[PDB]
Write an enzyme that holds these catalytic residues in place. Sequence first.
Site, PDB file in Angstrom:
ATOM      1  N   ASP A 116      41.728  47.051  31.583  1.00 26.23           N
ATOM      2  CA  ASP A 116      40.614  46.965  32.537  1.00 26.23           C
ATOM      3  C   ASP A 116      40.952  45.930  33.619  1.00 26.23           C
ATOM      4  OD1 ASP A 116      37.817  48.079  33.057  1.00 26.23           O
ATOM      5  OD2 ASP A 116      37.249  45.959  32.801  1.00 26.23           O
ATOM      6  N   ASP A 118      30.860  53.453  31.156  1.00 26.10           N
ATOM      7  CA  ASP A 118      30.015  52.679  32.110  1.00 26.10           C
ATOM      8  C   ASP A 118      29.116  53.557  33.000  1.00 26.10           C
ATOM      9  OD1 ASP A 118      30.842  49.990  31.541  1.00 26.10           O
ATOM     10  OD2 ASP A 118      32.615  50.296  32.778  1.00 26.10           O
ATOM     11  N   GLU A 127      43.260  50.788  34.730  1.00 24.67           N
ATOM     12  CA  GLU A 127      41.929  50.939  35.331  1.00 24.67           C
ATOM     13  C   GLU A 127      42.055  50.379  36.728  1.00 24.67           C
ATOM     14  OE1 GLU A 127      39.001  48.183  35.911  1.00 24.67           O
ATOM     15  OE2 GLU A 127      38.807  49.790  37.384  1.00 24.67           O
TER      16      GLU A 127
END
Lengths: 512, 514
Positions: free
Chosen positions: A309, A409, A356
């Site tokens: 991430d 998310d 990401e």
Amino acid sequence: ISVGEDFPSEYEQWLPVPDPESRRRAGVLLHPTSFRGPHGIGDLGEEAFRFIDWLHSTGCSVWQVLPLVPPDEGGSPYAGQDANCGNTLLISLDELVKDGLLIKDELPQPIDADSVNYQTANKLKSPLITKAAKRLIDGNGELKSKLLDFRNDPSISCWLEDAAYFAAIDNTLNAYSWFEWPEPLKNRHLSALEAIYESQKEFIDLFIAKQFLFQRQWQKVREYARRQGVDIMGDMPIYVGYHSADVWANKKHFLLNKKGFPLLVSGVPPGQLWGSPLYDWKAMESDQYSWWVNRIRRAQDLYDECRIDHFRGFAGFWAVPSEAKVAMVGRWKVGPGKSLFDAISKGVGKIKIIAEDLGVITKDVVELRKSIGAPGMAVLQFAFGGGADNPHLPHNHEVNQVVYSGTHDNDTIRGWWDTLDQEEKSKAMKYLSIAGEDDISWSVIQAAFSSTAQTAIIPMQDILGLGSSARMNTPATEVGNWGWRIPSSTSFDNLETESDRLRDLLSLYGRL
Amino acid sequence: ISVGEDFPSEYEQWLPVPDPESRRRAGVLLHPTSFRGPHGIGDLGEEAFRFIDWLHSTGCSVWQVLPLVPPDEGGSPYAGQDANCGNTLLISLDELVKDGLLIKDELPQPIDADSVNYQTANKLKSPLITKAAKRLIDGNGELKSKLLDFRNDPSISCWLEDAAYFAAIDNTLNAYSWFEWPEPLKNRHLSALEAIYESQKEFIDLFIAKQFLFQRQWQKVREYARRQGVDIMGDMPIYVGYHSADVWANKKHFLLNKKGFPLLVSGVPPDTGQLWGSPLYDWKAMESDQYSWWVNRIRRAQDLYDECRIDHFRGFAGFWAVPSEAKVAMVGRWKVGPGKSLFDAISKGVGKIKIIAEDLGVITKDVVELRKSIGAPGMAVLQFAFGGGADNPHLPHNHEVNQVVYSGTHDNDTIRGWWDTLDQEEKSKAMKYLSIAGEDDISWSVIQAAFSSTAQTAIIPMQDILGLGSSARMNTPATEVGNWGWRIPSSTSFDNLETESDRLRDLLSLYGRL
């Protein structure tokens, strides 16, 4: 083998051969907490093996999970308590019975499985996990012997011992963070650490035992996935928490002041103040990035592939003075770049990392991502704002990329569709192949499968065609996240229709 | 510029920028013979300019044509009479009036030609082209001066003079091919050539003048395309015809025997085979003079086109060679082609080139490797996508960026026609991949799949935009009659195609091809 001359006998058989590393595939995003069962939260028991069977029956070859670390009290796997430990609440109590560490009659009465309440799950399961861990340590057979192997293993102890001691001291002391600990614990004076081992020995042995139990159960899931042709893709946040062993036992790897408080913390500009401590990359460069090398070694022990991430942080990162109340007053700093990934590959071998790379990113990010061969992401739910240069539109997808319908998310496709902007909806209808709005998740699934992107991943919620109540996380809310579970009556046995329908799409688009 | 240190003030503005070389685009395949008009065949006049306006209104930025060479008697641009000359029947008579080489009242009465008849077109237009060419050469102003510039130009004369003499001798002699010519013409003895110039001077000067007139008109079309934001993509067959100036004036570059007859001719093996019968290049020999013949061919292609497709591109890596005695292709061997060293020589001689590789059918790994080493895009054709399985490279999910996607080419039926004769197995498969409404609109379904591809360039034949059936098919291979004749229906003006233009533009906008 010369201009004008005859080629050998069998020239027309010298045909192109597809590169196996380019093979198109698909997968499902499902965190093990969402599995069904009686103990308030999913686990690594029988539902994990049934899921793997079902997933294989679809033709998918990838299972993606969220990070498997011990989460925060709200349940977030992204604000974990340690970067390398496993979430002990995922330990199957029923699997412990089969090991003889619990007896059947010690299993608690079932509780209602609508959503994970992490406090309820902990209250119900932890006494029993502790009890099983206690019986393990007091025994002296095969299982105890395997615990010793685990414990004495050099590649376990380089994170496990620091993690155990940190947790013992946190247990014993009533303090907000380790910054408020007394000096010899704060700064890890050797004799204080030995005094911790002696005075908290039982807590330390039990912590270690519980990590062994998680490892045991996770490695059996992973071996069964390998047998069924399923790779498991993990996840890890680039930054770790201040109050953790990772920082406490490696202070010199982070930008701390002389008293051990962060000089600078993480975030992004207009802003968002995440507040994580930052890496001292220059310092890490000195010891050939050994901390990050270790982190990846452990990720490799847990997963076939791993997403990171906020990957952009490796090229450049936003740094905010820790005094500050908001993110707007920071500066961008130079990240380690490829030299980090050189060190990793040399230390651990060939790695499969996913970047990401959502939101606004700079040219160095793209260049760094491409230099290590890592795929980035496309998310179909982001594709219908703006114009036809939107990189989430399928015609702008790349081969070396992971396409999602959405992530944990985002709302589900159904939920997103319900609240979608009129301008964006009409655009979506032109581009997608939509039948009834009840089936909107399958329209989007199909677009994902039809992409040139090598890997297409779909959240289980969208396969089940569920609405907004099954959303996993809403960013910048602090409550009501991480709770989704597969409806208690929806077994994998009852999902043949969905499996057949996926398989048909995979076959049509060359992903089997 | 150091790990952990500060980046400059404006880091967040250092955003990725689309490479202009990667710009997605679309285009139409339309040969100029298909334009409407009164003189039996399309031309480089008003309709070419109106087409360019229409094309630009759609948002397309590429126009693809078939080769512009003088065709065979059946009308085929792929069995041309010369590799470098232009088809003079494309000269606009009405443009000649604007040059003062014809006067208005010398234009013929209109004829009806729903399809090109080449014999009728020639009978009607050639006397007048000749007459204009005569007036050009008898004058002594600007235009005559530009003819001299054209003629004396080193990069014209290296093909033009050979082409003019060849054609003069072919005119004067009654012979099948130049192999049957008397020895000093056959083998180009200097004095015989001078005897040809003096005895056939008028024919030679007029041949050259007509090539000048074609060049003038083609360059005016090409300039107007450039001003409207349209690139023009040409086409070139890899091999040339035996009976041509190309071979006759360059014998040492081909595999001929001592008496000038081909030792080996072109084709492809079974799957008997296909015996094309073209002479083959002496690649080792061409290597000696740094491939000068091929360098010249490309220089001329560059003068005519922004980009150029090469048919049977695979031939550059390996080619099928059949003994010229033979009656069928099955008894040949594969020979090693020049590979990248040919393209090194080209680029050194002419600069940066934009070549498209026709790479259809079974191809070997050296072809793909060669294509990729020079950066040339290959092809996908949607009409070929629905046989076989999901690894079919013509399926959109298997397309590549550096590629040209077609609905179909001039050798395929129209999408409507193809749909009508399509196999039931292939049709049901197609209906699963494509988004199909009514069968009358099937061409737009396929057009939309083409535009939706990641392939950088999507090209659609004009017939499919007009939604026409099998009667508008341009060519059916291995028939010899009824090809190359299609024209846009005489009542379908570009003024009447705003609906189609709007509909294309909307697809181009949706798929980022504007």
